[PDB]
Structure 1
């Protein structure tokens, strides 16, 4: 009855990580309410369970996990940002700026009209524009600005409760407004329109064949038996290479009654080469003929690539596609990693002539990741004072920038790693929920009193500030400027900085147009994050 409170206060790990299971269950619960969402479910469960005791909030854990989340988001968005900036015009930047200006004006007007205190204003902003990074900067600015200590403590205490109150709407709505209402008003279907636009533009992924080795076995009949590999290779068209007899790299050899040929190349070419000059196919069993990806070191050597086919090694791109002869004339001063296949040690000989091996594709140099996080934390402290306002970049924004720059600084020097794609997902699906659960648990004891005292006056203001700017930008961009349909959704979801909408829309659209949607949304994210984070302290200073 009452000892449960003591137990919960005494086992913080149990409390936090039981706030994370029921939350996900509730979020996945579907009762015709268009689901709820994992974050909202976690918040609700944390609020409900916080009533059984008093749990203080730990800053370091939340900061670390939020930093992980921001870094993962930045790394995921990195590669598409450059492509979108290259192809898409400045329309995305224009839409983001329009949205931010509209939100600023609307928030200022509403707060001035309703005579809202600076703390309530900051909380409503952070909980309506769904930007959790505000809280830290707002608290720092409150501490810095000179006012009475009672006011300082009151403002510091009043933020999280209104933040929690407004977040529920800021996430449950807006998502529906720009996922169903906007398509209904625009009389288009997400799938069809996105596919059409992607086909019109050059963004649809192009599947590529992967060249490999097939261990054929020679027939026991009579067809060019007892012959060297060099003449056979010369007879073969381009894109086919022999790989010895059993495991040997000797180029003279002697074909006997029974032995594998171990052809290498594409698929259609080997199909033709087996239809003509018939040969049997077998699974084969040998550890040789391993493939590798190797960077170059000898200043785009030409003759080595020219004679690799004679040597018995096939050269292909990183994706594993037979390269064109012209590619051998020049690559890209120095060159990049290429894929070699044939033989066991001949491939290594060609590699030694060329540069060293490439990233294993599944090993992560933890030094790089840890240094990135630490450098982001350090960069956060950098800041400047404008009109007595100590504005700083913050932590989450710095981590996002570091992720973007680090991702862009890859595949140009493919010598570090390829972080697994099954880790960023966990990071960006766990860190934010953990931070939200911590905040909700902390700001739960006084939630009922806060809602009783400050009631309807707050929720409606939060809803209007969350919704109206989206409608304004939608009308201005659709009826006046008349941009393409899907790009409107692509923006207004990065400027608003909400990831649930991003994930849901990507899943609905599908793989075909998923890269296109990612490109349409990437450029807005960084600008929105920076400006929306800076918009908190400015409001505090103005309304103080």
Structure 2
């Protein structure tokens, strides 16, 4: 009975990664009509495990794995923010401002009416308004602010316990309220209304067809044998070209017998070409005919574009698509494009068109590390407001750093892009690891604190977690008469619920997912910054 606790305290890695394994299973368990979720399951399992031992809490591991989560969230939100700012109106920002004001007023009123101490107030804020940087910011503010030392220790110790108590209700309750109750009240379907609104706007994604090189070989005795390749290419419709016979690129090489054309262009265009003149579609074996993407120079000469069209290299954008010849003159200078053709001829046109680009798969670890370092440096800075040393915080600055990096990489393509699955791994495991560490830390005195303050730490959290959403929903839908889905988006962005974001995104469908992302993106940054700042101000005010 003691040996198991000795083993658990001896090996922290086993404890941390065994409080993270069973949590996902508990979250994926289906009980009744609600699923607990990964974070809540991890918190419950950590709370149960932590009773056995006296495990302490490591600050650096949690800080790093939370900075990774914040950077991943900022990177994912990045591209949608500027698009929502351009196209969606300011009502998205206005809803967040209303929600923040309402939460401030309700929290102040409840804390004043119940005389809640500053430590419990910080815990209730950090739990009901689901933000994790509040714990660290409040600890730093409590350390800086002048009080008795015993008061400092008590206030610093009481925060994680109240955090773990109220976090349990916040995620599940607000998820249920924003996923079922509000759609039932508005008498809409989440899929249908969002699809209709996305159809009204132009957020609906449009698929892009990419040209490819298909190796059609010649039918012998087709009566077209004996025509020069340049005239055959001019015979092809707009957007077509033949790379050349075998792996060679020669202007005047008439058809001999059964040789390959390697037609490049759009699928329907190749189809009409085949119906114009029959050809054998053969898989072929050649590694020379490969496309390449290259960033252009500032001069971005178009005469070389015409000469490459004559030469046998199809022009396409970075995504890959045939484009109008009139776009040659009015192209964007120094814009990366993709071309298909011969092994070295594409490189020749590249040398005459611009510097070589870089592949998507490779990752700039130097840029990753520099982003993390700049996030920490930005979080260092802080100002004082009437004796309150407020600071941006470590996690909050990472969101801004990721946003700026994504926006700047969208324009300037010199830097490479982080793979998609890496971001999902980052956010998921980082958030669950931070939650597991906190829950393992605050576990021994859990039962003592739930004996000391039973109902005056859960009902307050429930009220502060539910009431502002109801007020802002009523104001937005009944009085101001906004659109249906943007209300959900703005509320779930202001409350900073990534689980609710993901659940509504997966329920709504892939068609309107770039709509919901645009609805949520402007809210997240303002909500995070103001909720991070709310903590120290509340501690100072109730103190």
* Pairwise TM-score range, normalised by the shorter structure: over 0.9
CA deviation profile, 1:98-126 (whole Å, cap 9, x unmatched): 00000000000000000000000000000
Residue 298 to residue 394, structure 1, CA distance change in 2 (3 Å): closer
CA deviation profile, 1:477-521 (whole Å, cap 9, x unmatched): 000100000000001111100100000000000110000000000
Q: Which moved more, 1:521-530 or 1:333-342?
A: 333-342
Q: CA deviation at 1:334?
A: 2.9
Q: CA deviation at 1:33?
A: 4.2
Contact 2:289 2:341 (C-alpha < 8 Å) held by counterparts? yes
Separation in 1 of the partners of 2:358 and 2:206? 24
Contact 2:334 2:354 (C-alpha < 8 Å) held by counterparts? no
Q: CA deviation at 1:468?
A: 0.2
Separation in 2 of the partners of 1:221 and 1:19? 73
SS of 2:384's equivalent in the other structure is strand
Contact 2:302 2:329 (C-alpha < 8 Å) held by counterparts? yes
Q: CA deviation at 1:146?
A: 0.4
Contact 2:127 2:164 (C-alpha < 8 Å) held by counterparts? yes
Contact 1:298 1:353 (C-alpha < 8 Å) held by counterparts? no
Separation in 2 of the partners of 1:2 and 1:98? 53
SS of 1:226's equivalent in the other structure is coil
CA deviation profile, 1:426-457 (whole Å, cap 9, x unmatched): 00000010000000000000000000001101
CA deviation profile, 1:367-388 (whole Å, cap 9, x unmatched): 0000000110011010100100
Separation in 1 of the partners of 2:46 and 2:164? 11
Indicate the residue corresponding to 2:313 in structure 1: 313
CA deviation profile, 1:57-87 (whole Å, cap 9, x unmatched): 0000000000000000000000000000000
Separation in 1 of the partners of 2:453 and 2:404? 43
Separation in 2 of the partners of 1:449 and 1:336? 64
Separation in 2 of the partners of 1:40 and 1:222? 71
Separation in 2 of the partners of 1:412 and 1:500? 30
Q: CA deviation at 1:319?
A: 1.1
Q: Which moved more, 1:222-231 or 1:420-429?
A: 222-231
SS of 1:222's equivalent in the other structure is coil
Contact 1:210 1:321 (C-alpha < 8 Å) held by counterparts? yes
CA deviation profile, 1:280-304 (whole Å, cap 9, x unmatched): 1111110011001100125121101
Separation in 2 of the partners of 1:258 and 1:108? 84
Separation in 1 of the partners of 2:139 and 2:126? 12
Separation in 1 of the partners of 2:184 and 2:287? 58
Contact 1:164 1:440 (C-alpha < 8 Å) held by counterparts? yes
SS of 1:384's equivalent in the other structure is strand
Q: TM-score, normalised to structure 2's length?
A: 0.99
1:53 aligns with 2:56: no
Separation in 2 of the partners of 1:276 and 1:97? 63
Q: CA deviation at 1:31?
A: 2.0
Separation in 2 of the partners of 1:222 and 1:10? 81
CA deviation profile, 1:402-441 (whole Å, cap 9, x unmatched): 0000000013111111210010000000001000000000
SS of 1:169's equivalent in the other structure is helix
CA deviation profile, 1:117-165 (whole Å, cap 9, x unmatched): 0000000000111101100110000000000000000000000000000
Separation in 1 of the partners of 2:235 and 2:156? 81
Separation in 1 of the partners of 2:142 and 2:456? 23
Contact 2:294 2:336 (C-alpha < 8 Å) held by counterparts? yes
Residue 298 to residue 524, structure 1, CA distance change in 2 (3 Å): closer
Separation in 2 of the partners of 1:22 and 1:248? 60
Q: CA deviation at 1:345?
A: 1.0
Q: CA RMSD in A?
A: 0.8
Q: Which moved more, 1:371-380 or 1:217-226?
A: 217-226
Contact 1:223 1:277 (C-alpha < 8 Å) held by counterparts? no
CA deviation profile, 1:240-280 (whole Å, cap 9, x unmatched): 01100001111111310121111101100100000111111
1:25-424 equivalence runs, <5 A: 25-297=25-297, 299-331=299-331, 334-424=333-423
Q: CA deviation at 1:342?
A: 1.2
1:14-33 equivalence runs, <5 A: 14-33=14-33
Q: CA deviation at 1:330?
A: 2.1
Contact 1:315 1:322 (C-alpha < 8 Å) held by counterparts? yes
Q: CA deviation at 1:359?
A: 2.4
Separation in 2 of the partners of 1:117 and 1:136? 18
Separation in 2 of the partners of 1:3 and 1:223? 89
Separation in 1 of the partners of 2:303 and 2:374? 44
Separation in 2 of the partners of 1:359 and 1:382? 35
SS of 2:56's equivalent in the other structure is coil
SS of 2:31's equivalent in the other structure is coil
